[PDB]
Amino acid sequence: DGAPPIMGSSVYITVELAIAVLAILGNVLVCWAVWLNSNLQNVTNYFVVSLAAADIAVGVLAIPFAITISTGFCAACHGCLFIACFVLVLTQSKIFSLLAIAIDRYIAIRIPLRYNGLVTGTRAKGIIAICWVLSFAIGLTPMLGWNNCGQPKEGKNHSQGCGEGQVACLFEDVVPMNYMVYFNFFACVLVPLLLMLGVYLRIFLAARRQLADLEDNWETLNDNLKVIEKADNAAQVKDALTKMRAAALDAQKEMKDFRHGFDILVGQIDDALKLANEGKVKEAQAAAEQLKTTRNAYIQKYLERARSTLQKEVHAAKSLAIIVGLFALCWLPLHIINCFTFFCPDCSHAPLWLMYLAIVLSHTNSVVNPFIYAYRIREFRQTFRKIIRS
Numbered sequence: 526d527g528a529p530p531i532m533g534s535s536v537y538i539t540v541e542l543a544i545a546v547l548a549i550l551g552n553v554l555v556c557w558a559v560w561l562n563s564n565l566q567n568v569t570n571y572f573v574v575s576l577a578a579a580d581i582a583v584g585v586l587a588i589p590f591a592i593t594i595s596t597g598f599c600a601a602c603h604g605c606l607f608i609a610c611f612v613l614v615l616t617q618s619k620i621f622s623l624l625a626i627a628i629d630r631y632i633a634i635r636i637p638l639r640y641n642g643l644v645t646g647t648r649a650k651g652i653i654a655i656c657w658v659l660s661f662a663i664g665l666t667p668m669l670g671w672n673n674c675g676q677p678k679e680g681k682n683h684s685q686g687c688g689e690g691q692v693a694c695l696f697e698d699v700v701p702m703n704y705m706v707y708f709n710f711f712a713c714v715l716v717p718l719l720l721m722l723g724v725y726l727r728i729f730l731a732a733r734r735q736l737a738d739l740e741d742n743w744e745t746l747n748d749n750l751k752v753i754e755k756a757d758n759a760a761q762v763k764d765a766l767t768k769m770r771a772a773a774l775d776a777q778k779e780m781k782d783f784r785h786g787f788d789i790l791v792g793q794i795d796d797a798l799k800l801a802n803e804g805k806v807k808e809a810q811a812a813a814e815q816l817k818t819t820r821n822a823y824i825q826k827y828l829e830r831a832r833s834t835l836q837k838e839v840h841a842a843k844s845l846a847i848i849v850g851l852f853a854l855c856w857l858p859l860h861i862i863n864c865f866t867f868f869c870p871d872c873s874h875a876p877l878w879l880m881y882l883a884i885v886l887s888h889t890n891s892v893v894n895p896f897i898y899a900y901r902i903r904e905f906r907q908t909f910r911k912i913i914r915s
């Protein structure tokens with residue numbers, strides 16, 4: 526006395542097709558933008574393109590595969606495994622791309638001087654090619670023998686009248702739930718997500734620490750100037766200048782103007798240090814006053830350009846952290862439900878409508894990333910305008 530299955534099926538099928546169209550259109554626009562604008566052609570966005578290629582494949586293949594496996598049609602169990610598991614291949618690829626982006630950004634903020642030599646486009650494409658081969662091996666592991674094809678549901682296969690060697694193609698009838706929980710969720714999804722959480726925490730820690738160091742060196746320059754103007758003994762000017770020369774060199778360690786600025790700064794510190802060692806207090810106090818002009822016309826510009834760059838890395842890393850968060854928000858419900866089905870055999874199985882609500886929610890993840898770029902990355906947003914208005 527249940528309502529006809531095709532009614533609820535029509536809603537689910539229609540919602541899936543709507544998601545597939547939006548996932549294809551949005552992520553093709555991402556790939557078109559990277560191809561068009563040279564400012565978007567860096568190593569980081571090569572993983573973003575690999576991320577967009579997987580979401581395009583979700584709408585082109587994974588979502589039609591989801592509609593197919595919802596019917597329970599008769600099929601050879603191994604071809605039925607590919608239909609069920611190919612979305613795991615695409616999802617795993619996205620995990621590798623997201624982990625590489627966070628690692629790339631950690632390298633850009635921990636060792637920015639060595640980034641361009643270490644992280645190159647040739648090495649990135651190799652990483653992406655390797656991670657795609659690993660994603661196939663991980664997602665299609667049930668095809669290697671870790672499946673329930675050896676224990677078919679003979680009642681379901683005879684009721685639907687399947688042929689010899691065929692089974693009723695159902696995700697939970699062919700894909701073992703211990704693979705989905707232990708291997709896929711715990712090892713291949715949950716652990717990499719916790720790793721990205723650790724990488725981003727180190728990124729924000731590295732940014733907060735470097736921002737504090739610039740202010741410490743900047744305040745050390747100005748506070749030690751007051752020590753010189755109010756000094757009385759030659760050693761009071763010598764010790765104050767010694768702690769400035771270190772703060773001057775430790776700050777530097779149109780790019781020649783920033784180097785020429787520290788040369789005048791440290792060159793003036795050595796001048797006053799020579800006068801302070803000779804005992805000339807007044808002549809060293811006046812020599813140290815010339816540092817104020819150099820601080821304004823040179824050092825103050827570096828303080829706020831290096832601060833502006835670090836703040837851009839914080840803002841950009843937060844935008845990329847949202848993509849990881851929305852990935853977790855879209856996929857965790859489906860994983861959590863699998864944990865209930867596997868770990869609590871005495872719990873009632875999650876209802877049909879909730880299963881397909883979680884399945885649909887995981888597919889919406891292929892729609893959100895182009896919106897994050899448009900709202901949080903100006904270079905993506907301006908290129909999106911240029912593409913659309915033209």
Ligand SMILES: CC(C)CCC[C@@H](C)[C@H]1CC[C@H]2[C@@H]3CC=C4C[C@@H](O)CC[C@]4(C)[C@H]3CC[C@]12C
Binds near residue numbers: 599600601607
């Ligand atoms: C380049 C792209 C677009 C090619 C698309 C490949 C897809 C559509 C092909 C490749 C393998 C095929 C599967 C392999 C054989 C199985 C078993 C059969 O009993 C039912 C069909 C089924 C489930 C096929 C469904 C369609 C299938 C998944």
Ligand SMILES: CC(C)CCC[C@@H](C)[C@H]1CC[C@H]2[C@@H]3CC=C4C[C@@H](O)CC[C@]4(C)[C@H]3CC[C@]12C
Binds near residue numbers: 853857862876879
């Ligand atoms: C990551 C964020 C969105 C958290 C998501 C919470 C979801 C995944 C949780 C909250 C309540 C949970 C449900 C509460 C208990 C019921 C009854 C049980 O017989 C089957 C599991 C089922 C249906 C759970 C399924 C998963 C569930 C719906």
Ligand SMILES: CC(C)CCC[C@@H](C)[C@H]1CC[C@H]2[C@@H]3CC=C4C[C@@H](O)CC[C@]4(C)[C@H]3CC[C@]12C
Binds near residue numbers: 861864866
């Ligand atoms: C990303 C972070 C939040 C980790 C994910 C949380 C998961 C691993 C936790 C949260 C809720 C937990 C479930 C809540 C209680 C149920 C019922 C119990 O009889 C079996 C364990 C089971 C099924 C737990 C399995 C693991 C579980 C799903």
Ligand SMILES: CCCCCCCC/C=C/CCCCCCCC(=O)OC[C@H](O)CO
Binds near residue numbers: 652658666
């Ligand atoms: C089976 C599921 C789990 C298995 C996981 C552990 C496998 C062990 C190690 C595999 C080596 C990696 C193989 C992938 C590399 C393929 C070759 C390639 O494309 O690399 C080109 C790169 O640019 C350089 O040449």
Ligand SMILES: CCCCCCCC/C=C\CCCCCCCC(=O)O
Binds near residue numbers: 585592597598
């Ligand atoms: C451009 C590539 C995408 C175009 C094709 C996708 C549109 C059709 C999607 C899949 C239709 C569902 C096929 C399920 C067949 C069930 C077999 C059965 O009748 O029991």
Ligand SMILES: CCCCCCCC/C=C\CCCCCCCC(=O)O
Binds near residue numbers: 657666
């Ligand atoms: C510049 C980078 C281009 C990336 C290209 C991505 C294409 C990767 C192709 C598929 C590799 C699949 C091979 C994996 C074999 C094991 C899977 C299995 O059969 O179980």
Ligand SMILES: CCCCCCCC/C=C\CCCCCCCC(=O)O
Binds near residue numbers: 624628631720724
């Ligand atoms: C198969 C060899 C694996 C090692 C090479 C891949 C490089 C590291 C990949 C991810 C491992 C987990 C990353 C955790 C934080 C790493 C960032 C760091 O410590 O610098």
